[PDB]
Every structure is written in structure tokens, then in C-alpha cells.
Design a binder for this molecule. Structure first.
Ligand SMILES: Cc1cc2nc3c(=O)[nH]c(=O)nc-3n(C[C@H](O)[C@H](O)[C@H](O)COP(=O)(O)OP(=O)(O)OC[C@H]3O[C@@H](n4cnc5c(N)ncnc54)[C@H](O)[C@@H]3O)c2cc1C
Ligand SMILES: Cc1cc2nc3c(=O)[nH]c(=O)nc-3n(C[C@H](O)[C@H](O)[C@H](O)COP(=O)(O)OP(=O)(O)OC[C@H]3O[C@@H](n4cnc5c(N)ncnc54)[C@H](O)[C@@H]3O)c2cc1C
Lengths: 363, 363
């Protein structure tokens, strides 16, 4: 007769959001099991977003447009500062950010967070653009997820590969599931979120000692960015193909990205020429976005699902009776281009929801 | 001092085409190593097509339009007949095929191959349509690939998971590679085939004793098919989304498919109603097609690649000298909706090409 945990949770999804959520929950003493198709070792899988990120910290919204986003970003920045001494985050000093106009600078909301925030002279901006410079942070996206997974291991979390098609498959040994499935949220019966949408991102991974980050959104015909990451590599971007699921490498996009990035910073090349850029890999990832913005909220759901709850429910459309339980589903998906920079704060909110659901529904 | 094989080949890709090609090569005494991202155990992976097929034998082209296709289909039918006694293929007796008009029946070219080929009365066709009936064959797509893999094991072939980005990575221990990468052919440096394109196929897998196959192309607004497969299941289709990469399940498509299939054959349901259909799974696969049709041909290529051979070549665009070898690349991809039904014959042609390249270039 052993005393068993009464704090079992399943985290569905093992991208940066599921991992982060799982880790804060494990630290809170929950017994966490992670079910996911794609795990942190899957560093070249295109069926999730987390391998493909820069990943730096670049707010995309004003406070009014994205209040949660800013909260989550501010918390995550603090966490990443803490990870610098052990090398899991890296300073991007004198990052340059260009926008089409003052509006594009988002009210400078984050100017107390990123050190050394100041306007750039126009001489230091692309023609016609406006700019600021500041010190921000980046992580090595796949290695960051792997770091989180090691931390999870130590805290007793376990992992299992599984591809779920219906919610009851996730409610396996737990009455609460954290739904961190990115794009998968659309096709799991019981979630069925039609608002989930990819935003396609093509990049070039380059071998370069360049330590300068440049984020250029000043040309609406050509998104571009240069994001150094721990390890002597830089990610050159990019694209924002809303609703585009295409996983193939576009060769014209390669040329556009490298030419633009070279304009922004010739030192990504050995000799300031395209031909001098040491290409390591051509990448395409699908950012997991959601119309209406990220979904971070707790839902109460009765199982088994019926065809009235979900067009994708399994079995015959005639459903009832056998057996019925009510469970908690805590959503955490749709972070689009900002999943890493929001991850820790989002995970904090997820963990608060789990605590509250446990109080209300799970003893 | 052992006598080593001088007949090493690598097969890049482990869908039905790579497996089939590998098997005929292994039977011919080649030492085959298969490199692929997706292997036969990966029965729910959307990053290759082979898990998702019916898979039956339904010619799609006239002889003039598709001479190779017909050759390959006729050979594969013979192979599948041979697999009936051991249950790896199954007869679909009295299959019904509907088309918009006589042209859609493709000159009835295959009428000596499928037993009991005859026209259907209009009373037995959807309104306004034309039809034929015949006996054809199907295989259980994932299990068929697994069968091929067991056969390969016995013949000494080996498997390795790898995701290649540049050809030199495939020319690993062999001077000849069979390129059977489906959609991946577009993004591998040294292949770079812009003509590769997905054709998206959504299906519903249903639990039903229905043993009748119905192929309906008589409604251009609603492709539909019912394909029984070994094991008491039927695949209900479908879609042909050319250029569509969307991996998510469309709920409207579910309704359209099931309603149409039910019109075609109520016995896919327990009670002839939608609500009586026992749904097992909602599936989306991307058929690996190619503008210009399937590519089955041998190419001679110099390694290392340079940026002049490939926009996606790795390293700096300034390339030369170090070291240079010429190798053989035997293409086998772009089979679209007919990869299973063409597989054995296509593999025969691939093996002939390998034999010929070995004579000409490899001693
Ligand atoms: C080119 C590119 C650049 C980026 N740069 C940055 C950056 O600088 N900063 C930033 O903050 N972000 C950046 N992002 C965004 C970031 O990659 C994402 O927002 C983030 O990875 C989302 O994490 P997630 O955990 O929500 O989703 P994912 O990483 O997509 O993980 C979803 C998880 O759910 C699993 N799953 C899905 N469906 C099922 C199922 N049915 N059954 C079981 N498991 C399932 C997946 O397999 C996987 O484990 C970039 C993304 C890209 C493509
Ligand atoms: C809904 C649906 C229904 C179908 N019904 C039928 C049917 O009834 N009859 C029929 O004949 N066909 C049918 N098909 C078509 C059939 O599924 C395909 O044509 C066939 O599976 C193609 O096989 P393949 O080996 O060429 O490609 P794939 O199965 O796509 O395999 C490509 C292989 O290459 C690997 N690869 C790709 N890129 C890389 C890389 N960079 N590095 C390493 N490996 C890589 C893949 O991982 C995988 O091993 C259907 C398909 C679908 C979606």
C-alpha cells in the first residue's frame, strides 16, 4: 500500500510550449507524462514548429493588441537572462530593428526590458525606414527544447510517442491534459479548432561568426532577419506565408533572403558576397498560429465525445451512455511567430490554470 | 581477405516505390541499403504518401497518354494475383467504375487484365453517368510495405533513417543511388525538381464488412471511392487537391465524402445511414506527383555538387576542385495516385536501368 500521486497530468505536445508547461508543472510537484508525435530529438521534423525557430526575443505587438503576449514575453526575458551563465541563452548586443514607420515600433513598450534601447539614426537604417537598437536574447531552438527535456527528466517527467486523433486517447492515466499541439489542434476530435493556421517560414542556416542580430520589417515585399544562435551559426530569414502548408524549399526565396540579409549585414559572408555565404541547411517550418490569437484557457469536457461535440468523433454517429466522465483540458496553442519568446510566461499561465482546475475539479 | 560485393546500391526512400525497387534489386543479387526519413513502421506519418493509399488497381490513363503507366500496371496486376493465396492482395470482385462519359473509361484498355470486365446498365450507374464492372485487386497499403520490408530483410537489405539535404549524403558506400523520395525530390540539392507537386487526398477509414469496391469519377464536383482492404476495413474517399499541402482534416470534406459514398453503397454503414458508419480514422496524405509525369530514368552526376548544379548546394557558392567523382542516380518518383498499382512494373524498369548502368559505368 503505497501513497500515490494525486497530481497526475498529461501534456499533449512536446514543442517548446508543451515542454515549458510540463516543466513548471513538474517543479510544482505534478506527475507529468508527455504524449507527443514529435519529441526534442526530432530536430529536422517538419511536422512541428519548434525545431525551426531563431529563436530570439522580438515583440511583435503593442500592449493594447497583445497584452498577454507582452506579459509572457517580459517573463520569458527574465528567464532567459538567468540562462546566460550556463550558455542556454545568448546576448544579441546591439540588435538592430527596422520598421516601415513609427507605428511599426509598437510604442517601444519593451524599452525597459531590453538593455540599451535607443533610436537609430536614419544613416544606420535602410533607406526610408525607421529603426531602434537594443540588446536582446536568443536560444538555440532545438537544443533549448532538449535542455528543457533534460530538466524534465530530472523532475520525474516521462515521454511517450503517440499521435492522438481523439481526446480520450490523451486522457490516459490523467483527468487533466494540457493541449499544446500547435497545428494539430485542428484535427483532434474534441478540439477541432478550425482557427488554427500555419504561417510558413523558410530560412537559410549559415555558418558565420556574425554576432549581430538584424530584424528588418521595413520592406513589406521582403521580410528579412539575421539571428545568431549559440554555436557559430546564424539563421537568415524569412517568410510569413499565412495559410501556406508548403514544406518544400523555394529556390527563388533562397536568393531573396540571402541578398536581403547581405544588404543588412555583409559579415554573414566570408567576403561580403552571396557566394561567400557558408550555407549549412535550407529550412521550412510551419509556425502554429491561430486566428483570434493564442489560446490559453481551461475547458471542461465530457467523455466519451459524441458526433454532436465533434465532426471527427470516432465510431458511429449514434453515440451516448457508455460511460461518461468530465475532465479538464487546458489549451496552450497558436503562438505563431512568438512561441519561444512567450514560452515561459505562457507556461506560467498554464500552470496557474492547472492549479485552479485542480482546486475546483480534481480534489 | 574476403570477397566483397561489387554490387552495392543505395535506395533513397522507403515508400512503396523504393521498397519495390530495392526488393527486385536484392533479388538480382545487389547489396542494398535503404536510406529514408519515413520507414514502413511509420504508418501514420504524413511526410510520405505510402501509408495512406487504398490501395487498389484502377488505371487512370489511356494507353496513348500513359504507355509506361499501363505497362507498369499490367505487370503489377500479375504480381498481386500471385499474392492472393498468402493474403497480401485481395480480390475486389464486381468492382463498379463510374465516369462522366465514354472518354472517361480510357478505351477500356485493361479489359483483358481485370477478369469479368463488362459495361454496366445505366440502371446500375449514378444518374447521367456511364459505368463498367470488373474484378480488380487491392492491398493493405501499410502492411504491404511492411511485407516488402520483411522480404528485403531476408534478402540481406538493410535500413537506416536519414533525411538527406544534398546528394552526396546518399552516395554513402555506393556509386549508384535509386532516388525514390516522392515529394522530397524537390528540395534535395542535386535533384531540385520543381515539377514535383503534392496532390492532397483526404479519406475516411471505416470499419465495415463491405467487400464491394466503387470508383466514382462521374461527378466532377465530388470525387468518391470505396476501397475495401484486407482486414474488414474500407477506405472512403476522396479528394485530388493539386498543389495543396494542407495536412489538416477538413470537416466539410468528411461530410461530403461520407454522404457520397453512402449513395454509392449503403452497406458501408450498419444501417444505411451516415450515423451508422463506424469511423476508425480521418486521414490526409499528399500524393507525390510530378508535372510531366513520373520520372524513371538514370542520370550521371558529378560530385561534389556546385552552386551551378544546384541553387540549394551546401557550403559557399564558390565551389570547385575538391575532389570529384561521377556517380549514377536512378530516378523513380512522381507516381501521383498510382504508385501502388504501378510499383512492381516501375521497380522492374528501375532494376533494368541499374543493370545497364552497372554494365556501362560500374564494371
Ligand atoms: C522559421 C521560423 C522562425 C521562428 N523564430 C522564432 C523566434 O525567433 N522566436 C519565437 O519566439 N518563435 C519563433 N518561431 C515560432 C516558434 O517556432 C513557434 O511558435 C513555437 O515553436 C510553437 O511551439 P508549440 O509548442 O506551440 O508548437 P510545436 O513546436 O509545433 O509543437 C506541437 C507539438 O504537438 C505535437 N502534436 C501535434 N499534433 C499532435 C497529435 N495529433 N498527437 C500528438 N502530438 C501532436 C507535435 O508533435 C509536437 O510535439 C519561428 C518559427 C519558425 C518556423
Ligand atoms: C488518399 C490516398 C489514396 C491512394 N490510393 C492509391 C491507390 O488505391 N492505388 C495506388 O496505386 N496508389 C494510391 N495512392 C498513391 C500512392 O499512395 C502513392 O503514389 C505512392 O505511395 C508513392 O510512393 P513513393 O514511394 O513514390 O512515395 P512515398 O510513399 O511518399 O515515399 C517517399 C519516401 O522518400 C523518403 N524521403 C522523402 N524525402 C527524403 C529525404 N530528403 N531524405 C530521405 N528520405 C526522404 C520518404 O521519407 C519516404 O521513405 C493514394 C495515395 C493517397 C494519399
Amino acid at each position: 500500500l503505497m501513497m500515490h500521486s494525486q497530481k497526475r497530468v498529461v501534456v499533449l505536445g512536446s514543442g517548446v510550449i508543451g515542454l515549458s508547461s510540463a516543466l513548471i508543472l513538474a517543479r510544482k510537484g505534478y506527475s507529468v507524462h508527455i504524449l507527443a508525435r514529435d519529441l526534442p530529438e526530432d530536430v529536422s521534423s517538419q511536422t512541428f514548429a519548434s525545431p525551426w525557430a531563431g529563436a530570439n526575443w522580438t515583440p511583435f505587438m503593442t500592449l493594447t493588441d497583445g497584452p498577454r503576449q507582452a506579459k509572457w514575453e517580459e517573463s520569458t526575458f527574465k528567464k532567459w537572462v538567468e540562462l546566460v551563465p550556463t550558455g542556454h541563452a545568448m546576448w544579441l548586443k546591439g540588435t538592430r530593428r527596422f520598421a516601415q514607420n513609427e507605428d511599426g515600433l509598437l510604442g517601444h513598450w519593451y524599452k525597459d526590458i531590453t538593455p540599451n534601447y535607443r533610436p537609430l539614426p536614419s544613416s544606420e537604417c535602410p533607406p526610408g525606414a525607421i529603426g531602434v537598437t537594443y540588446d536582446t536574447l536568443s536560444v538555440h531552438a532545438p537544443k533549448y527544447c532538449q535542455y528543457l527535456a533534460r530538466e524534465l527528466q530530472k523532475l520525474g517527467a516521462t515521454f511517450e510517442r503517440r499521435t492522438v486523433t481523439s481526446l480520450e486517447q490523451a486522457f490516459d492515466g490523467a483527468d487533466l491534459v494540457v493541449n499544446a499541439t500547435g497545428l494539430g489542434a485542428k484535427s483532434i476530435a474534441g478540439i477541432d479548432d478550425q482557427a488554427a493556421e500555419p504561417i510558413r517560414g523558410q530560412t537559410v542556416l549559415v555558418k558565420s561568426p556574425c554576432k549581430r542580430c538584424t530584424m528588418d520589417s521595413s520592406d513589406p515585399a521582403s521580410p528579412a532577419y539575421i539571428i545568431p544562435r549559440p554555436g557559430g551559426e546564424v539563421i537568415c530569414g524569412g517568410t510569413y506565408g499565412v495559410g501556406d502548408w508548403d514544406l518544400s524549399v523555394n529556390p527563388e526565396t533562397v536568393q531573396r533572403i540571402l541578398k536581403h540579409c547581405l544588404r543588412l549585414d555583409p559579415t554573414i559572408s566570408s567576403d561580403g558576397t552571396i557566394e561567400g555565404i557558408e550555407v549549412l541547411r535550407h529550412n521550412v517550418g510551419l509556425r502554429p498560429a491561430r486566428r483570434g490569437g493564442p489560446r490559453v484557457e481551461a475547458e471542461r469536457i465530457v467523455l466519451p465525445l459524441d458526433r454532436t461535440k465533434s465532426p471527427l468523433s470516432l465510431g458511429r454517429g449514434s453515440a451516448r451512455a457508455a460511460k461518461e466522465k468530465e475532465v479538464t483540458l487546458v489549451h496552450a496553442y497558436g503562438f505563431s511567430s512568438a512561441g519561444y519568446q512567450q514560452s515561459w510566461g505562457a507556461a506560467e499561465d498554464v500552470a496557474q490554470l492547472v492549479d485552479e482546475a485542480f482546486q475546483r475539479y480534481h480534489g
